[PDB]
């Protein structure tokens, strides 16, 4: 009797798999357990697992092969999200040193928000703006936190046009704040025909 554990692991610790099998009965009977029930226990107990395969193999081997979700962003505010828009979670202690963009959105919007972070993010990076946070509301209104603590209220309209104008007309506002020892903390391109801008002292 032996347990062969494969697949790439970042969040999965040994005990996690150990405690899954143990939940099913006494140690030493583990080889007589139901392979589909083991799979259920792992999927349930370890929500960062995207795919688990469990099978018995000759001679006397329990093969368990794991595939973990891979996060590209955090998801309001306890969950994470992967490149395919799948939503999952992982105990906080296991992830406190990862620099990830933060996405916020209504429940079930994970993928909608993601495609927007994708599009906005790439139009921004073309210049120097690091897209740090992206919040979509239940109406489809958007706010962004850029590289410094810069909040960008983009609104509900056509947002790529406004984001574009922001890119064109941020350089000159930057030079204004710097000459006057401030930094641009907030921008409101929420509305056609108007913009508001807020500043704050510079560190």
UniProtKB/Swiss-Prot annotation:
It is found in: Cell inner membrane. Changing residue 68 to K: Impairs localization. One of its GO terms (cellular component) is FtsQBL complex. Keywords: Cell cycle, Cell division, Cell inner membrane, Cell membrane, Membrane, Transmembrane, Transmembrane helix. Induction: Repressed by hydroxyurea. Residues 1-203 are periplasmic. Part of a complex composed of FtsB, FtsL and FtsQ. The complex can be formed before its localization to the division site. This tripartite complex can be divided further into a subcomplex of FtsB and FtsL, which forms in the absence of FtsQ. Interacts with FtsA, FtsK, FtsL, FtsB, FtsW, FtsI, FtsN, FtsX and YmgF. Belongs to the FtsQ/DivIB family. FtsQ subfamily. Essential cell division protein. May link together the upstream cell division proteins, which are predominantly cytoplasmic, with the downstream cell division proteins, which are predominantly periplasmic. May control correct divisome assembly. This is Cell division protein FtsQ. It comes from Escherichia coli (strain K12). The lineage of its organism: Bacteria, Pseudomonadati, Pseudomonadota, Gammaproteobacteria, Enterobacterales. The gene is ftsQ. The chain holds residues 58 to 260 of 276 of the full protein.
